[PDB]
Amino acid sequence: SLSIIDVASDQNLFQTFIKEWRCKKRFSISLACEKIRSIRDDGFPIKGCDDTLVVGLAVCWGGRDAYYFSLQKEPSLTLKDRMWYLQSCLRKESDKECSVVIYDFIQSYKILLLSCGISLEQSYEDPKVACWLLDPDSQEPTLHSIVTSFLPHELPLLEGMETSQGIQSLGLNAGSEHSGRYRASVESILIFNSMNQLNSLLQKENLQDVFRKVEMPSQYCLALLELNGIGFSTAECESQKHIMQAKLDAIETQAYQLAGHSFSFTSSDDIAEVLFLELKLPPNREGRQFSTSKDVLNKLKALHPLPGLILEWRRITNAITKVVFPLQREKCLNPFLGMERIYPVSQSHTATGRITFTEPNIQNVPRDFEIKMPMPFSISMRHAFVPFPGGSILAADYSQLELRILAHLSHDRRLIQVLNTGADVFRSIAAEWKMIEPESVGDDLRQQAKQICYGIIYGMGAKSLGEQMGIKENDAACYIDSFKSRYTGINQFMTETVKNCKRDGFVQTILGRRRYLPGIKDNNPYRKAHAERQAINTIVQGSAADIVKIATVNIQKQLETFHSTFKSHGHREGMCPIRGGFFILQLHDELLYEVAEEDVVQVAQIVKNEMESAVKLSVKLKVKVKIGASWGELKDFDV
DNA sequence: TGAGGCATCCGTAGC
DNA sequence: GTGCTACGGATGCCTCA
Ligand SMILES: Nc1nc2c(ncn2[C@H]2C[C@H](O)[C@@H](COP(=O)(O)OP(=O)(O)OP(=O)(O)O)O2)c(=O)[nH]1
Numbered sequence: 001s002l003s004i005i006d007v008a009s010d011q012n013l014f015q016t017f018i019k020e021w022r023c024k025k026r027f028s029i030s031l032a033c034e035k036i037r038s039i040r041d042d043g044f045p046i047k048g049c050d051d052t053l054v055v056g057l058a059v060c061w062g063g064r065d066a067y068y069f070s071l072q073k074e075p076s077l078t079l080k081d082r083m084w085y086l087q088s089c090l091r092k093e094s095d096k097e098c099s100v101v102i103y104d105f106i107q108s109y110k111i112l113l114l115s116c117g118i119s120l121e122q123s124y125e126d127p128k129v130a131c132w133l134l135d136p137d138s139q140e141p142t143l144h145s146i147v148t149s150f151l152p153h154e155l156p157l158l159e160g161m162e163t164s165q166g167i168q169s170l171g172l173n174a175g176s177e178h179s180g181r182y183r184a185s186v187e188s189i190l191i192f193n194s195m196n197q198l199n200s201l202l203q204k205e206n207l208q209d210v211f212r213k214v215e216m217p218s219q220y221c222l223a224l225l226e227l228n229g230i231g232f233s234t235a236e237c238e239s240q241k242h243i244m245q246a247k248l249d250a251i252e253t254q255a256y257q258l259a260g261h262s263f264s265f266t267s268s269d270d271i272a273e274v275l276f277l278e279l280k281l282p283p284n285r286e287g288r289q290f291s292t293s294k295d296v297l298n299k300l301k302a303l304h305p306l307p308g309l310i311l312e313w314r315r316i317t318n319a320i321t322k323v324v325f326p327l328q329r330e331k332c333l334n335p336f337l338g339m340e341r342i343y344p345v346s347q348s349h350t351a352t353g354r355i356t357f358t359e360p361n362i363q364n365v366p367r368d369f370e371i372k373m374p375m376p377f378s379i380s381m382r383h384a385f386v387p388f389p390g391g392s393i394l395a396a397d398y399s400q401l402e403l404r405i406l407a408h409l410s411h412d413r414r415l416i417q418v419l420n421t422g423a424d425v426f427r428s429i430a431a432e433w434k435m436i437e438p439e440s441v442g443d444d445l446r447q448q449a450k451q452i453c454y455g456i457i458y459g460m461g462a463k464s465l466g467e468q469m470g471i472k473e474n475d476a477a478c479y480i481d482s483f484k485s486r487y488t489g490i491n492q493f494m495t496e497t498v499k500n501c502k503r504d505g506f507v508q509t510i511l512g513r514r515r516y517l518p519g520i521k522d523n524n525p526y527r528k529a530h531a532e533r534q535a536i537n538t539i540v541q542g543s544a545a546d547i548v549k550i551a552t553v554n555i556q557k558q559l560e561t562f563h564s565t566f567k568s569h570g571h572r573e574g575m576c577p578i579r580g581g582f583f584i585l586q587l588h589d590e591l592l593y594e595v596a597e598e599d600v601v602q603v604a605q606i607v608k609n610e611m612e613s614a615v616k617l618s619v620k621l622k623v624k625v626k627i628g629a630s631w632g633e634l635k636d637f638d639v
Numbered sequence: 640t641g642a643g644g645c646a647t648c649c650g651t652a653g654c
Numbered sequence: 655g656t657g658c659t660a661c662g663g664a665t666g667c668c669t670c671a
Contacts, residue, residue, distance in 0.1 A: 266663080293650070318651055322662060352658060354654085361660045364653045450654095451656085458656040529655065537657045541654095588654045588658085 001064060004185045008070040014077060017067055021059065021089050028060040028101045028192035031108050032171040032184035041073045044115040054115055055180045058188035066185035071116065090120040101125045103143065103191045104169045106223045117574050124216045127195040133207055136515050137351045140167045143190065151194040157186055210512045214546060217553040221583060222346045227570030229343040230362060230584045232331060236384040241324050243379050244316050247371060251313045265313055268292045275306065295467065319366050323381055326360040336572060337388050352538050353513065353545035354588050363587055383632030387594045388578055392627055394600060395634055396607045397590035399622040405543045406457065408617045412489025419619045426450055456480065457490065459533050497539055498532050507535045509542040551614040552591060558606050563599060600627060604637055
């Protein structure tokens with residue numbers, strides 16, 4: 001079976017291992033974390049858990065042999081020289097081509113850099129990203145799930161360890177009451193052989209170029225982002241919280257003085273029984289007596305002031321109960337930079353290809369919205385995200401990215417001609433719908449126009465479009481058919497995509513990633529329409545995500561070949577004025593960068609150029625770089 | 640037969 | 655019957671005293 005070889009305590013064996021490791025061009029290094037249940041002797045401490053330590057590594061390069069490097073203090077080779085050799089063997093020198101294979105690459109990168117002090121810089125392979133690339137809408141892979149599906153022969157090796165069931169590497173988890181050496185070696189072996197199998201399957205499926213050109217470098221950029229962390233104030237959040245609490249108290253007092261009956265706003269039954277039947281306000285067509293949602297109250301805001309007040313109350317509460325407490329609970333002092341930041345946890349296992357943050361979900365911070373205090377106070381929570389002192393947020397978003405991708409994929413000559421020239425379409429359709437002049441639109445009206453346009457692109461209509469359109473169904477359908485007649489490319493693209501998905505069973509992104517939609521053949525009109533809508537949405541959203549990833553990796557390369565300094569806020573922990581192009585957040589269309597006010601004039605170019613040359617499309621890509629002292633007040637930048 | 644803990648769904652937000 | 659995601663709170667359902 002396994003042939004674990006301890007490289008420590010032997011000198012000739014250590015030198016042989018070093019030379020063979022340097023000769024080999026494909027590693028399978030894996031970490032090994034253990035408990036302190038019996039410091040500075042057994043290993044290196046880990047940030048976030050003081051009860052766990054890192055002991056050693058398991059390196060495999062073929063067969064069932066898993067060499068075990070030891071970082072333990074436990075004498076010809078001391079800790080310093082072993083660390084020196086370990087760092088030297090993990091760096092690219094003289095076009096040395098290597099392919100490191102790590103399970104859960106981001107976590108291992110962070111653990112090695114922050115604790116041990118080693119930043120591996122080579123070509124990475126993760127036997128959990130390729131599995132997603134194969135089937136994008138499966139469960140999050142586990143070591144047991146990978147071994148069962150791709151390396152069944154070594155399946156009996158995974159016996160006695162129940163930690164493989166969870167979504168975490170075998171060596172990193174501190175449970176199972178096993179020695180870290182054995183878990184690390186077994187992991188190493190499995191993630192090498194199964195990764196060989198995955199590479200074979202990827203080459204068969206023609207997805208290896210995407211895997212090694214745009215996916216793993218994107219994971220590296222995400223690791224840098226998670227090391228950086230978005231800044232925080234804790235001085236503006238309290239101000240907004242106090243203002244919102246005062247407004248909530250005012251709303252409650254006004255409701256009490258108006259109706260005179262206890263409400264319990266969170267209780268839908270009480271609201272229905274005191275609003276739909278008590279205080280007039282007849283309900284719509286459809287305990288559980290009447291529906292109380294945003295749409296039903298929006299349809300009768302003007303009839304009575306009370307529904308508007310309760311909608312305002314619910315909207316304000318769904319900013320302190322869901323956006324204020326999560327941020328205030330999750331903060332870090334970050335002594336080096338002298339400010340409180342917040343470090344999210346990314347996830348790239350989404351169905352389309354987008355990246356979502358899950359602790360907290362920073363991509364859902366509420367926008368700016370006015371308020372009345374018996375003039376608007378601008379209580380937006382985005383005002384509390386600030387850069388390091390002497391820094392500026394340098395956001396850079398594509399303008400109409402999905403629309404441009406759709407124009408490129410549809411070959412609509414008229415739409416391409418419209419988009420290539422400098423003009424606007426969403427504002428124009430908003431003004432035409434609201435009869436105001438074309439050069440006049442509100443921000444909420446802009447958002448509503450975006451919703452309407454993307455809905456009619458994705459195939460909605462009939463009664464659904466009417467509620468947001470505020471118009472009858474007949475003229476709405478007339479407008480829909482007229483637009484379909486003057487957007488021939490869009491309808492032809494929809495028909496072609498549906499037919500191709502019917503023929504093949506999968507829709508292919510512009511880069512090559514494909515998603516499987518069996519529901520196309522569901523024989524049920526509702527589910528068939530849902531699957532067609534999924535295909536049409538995916539073929540564009542995945543393309544947008546891939547273009548954003550290409551832009552991210554290109555920007556990272558361009559600002560890493562320049563600006564000689566630490567690559568991230570986590571790299572300076574391994575020890576100078578802060579100067580660089582740090583990457584802090586991605587909003588599915590934007591790349592927030594935390595730039596000091598000395599490289600901005602350069603970075604605002606390097607970003608704006610590199611986002612424009614990411615993919616050669618028929619329609620030119622537009623980038624709107626905006627600079628500001630905070631995520632709330634972002635003013636446009638000339639260049 | 641009543642009560643407490645857990646699995647599930649809903650309505651909100653962003654893109 | 656617009657799609658992707660996260661998530662705190664409401665609402666049963668199952669189980670135990
Ligand atoms: N508002 C809205 N956006 C959607 C919808 N479906 C997809 N999106 C996608 C389209 C784009 O890829 C992305 C929008 O990203 P942004 O809001 O950052 O675009 P941006 O504001 O920079 O430009 P824009 O206002 O759209 O002209 O979200 C939808 O139903 N509503």
